[PDB]
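Q: What does the assembly look like in three dimensions?
Context provided by user:
Components: two
Sequences:
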Amino acid sequence: LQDSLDAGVGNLVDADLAKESAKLQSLQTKQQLGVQALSIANQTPQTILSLF
Amino acid sequence: LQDSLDAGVGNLVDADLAKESAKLQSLQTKQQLGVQALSIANQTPQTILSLF
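A: Here is the predicted structure of the complete assembly.
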């Protein structure tokens, strides 16, 4: 019964790490893509300076 | 919400400078033409001296 209760605790709280590896690599790509998009959005306003 | 309020203040007060460049160049040309027209208007009266 104690082994069953420990297995139930593990079923209740434990994460599935094998899916987390793919989620981690995808988020690591997404964060750099977001940094690049933010850099381009920062660059965008300054083109007005060429008009003067 | 703070970002939305900042965007609304910018929508309210901010100028569109890309039109301002054209307005500035046209206003400079208009100022030069106005100085020329004022110069001719100053010159006009003094032709009376040829009659005497």
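Follow-up: DSSP finds two helices and no strands in chain A.
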